[PDB]
Chains A and B, each alone.
Chain A
Amino acid sequence: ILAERRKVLAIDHLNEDQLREKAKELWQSIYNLEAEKFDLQEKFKQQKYEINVLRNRINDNQ
């Protein structure tokens, strides 16, 4: 699956221009995956906080 999200990179038939295009599109994909990573990190931090509170209530509930 890591291999599946490892997309196909075909850069032989691409001349210099389509090489620039492929490099930039891979860069943009990197940017978007960094975006999802940061969002899931913020969600996970809010989650760890709320789970601190949840175990607080658990101690209060049991």
Chain B
Amino acid sequence: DDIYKAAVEQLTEEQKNEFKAAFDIFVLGAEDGCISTKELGKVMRMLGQNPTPEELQEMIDEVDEDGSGTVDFDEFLVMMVRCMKDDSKGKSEEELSDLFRMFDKNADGYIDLDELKIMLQATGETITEDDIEELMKDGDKNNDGRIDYDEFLEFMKGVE
């Protein structure tokens, strides 16, 4: 969600206050005070849309990362910056191959730990070796210490 977490961080304090007032209007009659089923229903009929309940529960539980079962104001901001889409084009498999031949400096087929290590250290932002290890584990779905090609794709698919 780093894409739309930057998106909400791309918002100004004025946009956050507007969305807070929109959340205030959102939960009129809320048992949870958050965006549960009836909140989505009433704010959708506020404009005149008629969605299905299964889509509604899907949107509720998906943006619910912890398992809270409802959409909180933070998840509300996430869906607000979702429909105004920011992360364009999600550079992908072919670009990711151009990137992966590099990432795998060994020219073998897997991004070794020192290889992704140098790759991150060269990024310019705050680079820990925890970055290297965890981006390994998330790229290298095998967690073997070596990110395969497809492992690098799902490692970097959709990433702006």
Report A-B touching, CB under 8 Å: yes
- Residue numbers of A with Cβ under 8 A of B are 46, 49-50, 52-57, 60-61
Give the distance in Å from the alpha carbon of A50 to the alpha carbon of B100 in the complex: 9
Give the distance in Å from the alpha carbon of A50 to the alpha carbon of B148 in the complex: 11
Query: B148 to A52, Cβ gap below 8 A?
Result: no
What A residues does B110 contact at CB under 8 A?
53, 56
Query: A56 to B101, Cβ gap below 8 A?
Result: no
- Residue numbers of B with Cβ under 8 A of A are 97, 100-101, 104, 107-110, 142, 148-150
Distance in Å from the Cβ of A36 to the closest Cβ of chain B?
21
Residue of A with least CB distance to B107: A49
What would 13 more interface pairs be, CB under 8 Å, given A53-B148, A55-B109, A61-B150? A49-B101, A49-B107, A49-B108, A49-B109, A50-B97, A50-B101, A53-B110, A53-B149, A56-B109, A56-B148, A56-B149, A60-B142, A60-B148
Distance in Å from the Cβ of A58 to the closest Cβ of chain B?
10
Give the distance in Å from the alpha carbon of A57 to the alpha carbon of B110 in the complex: 10
What A residues does B100 contact at CB under 8 A?
53
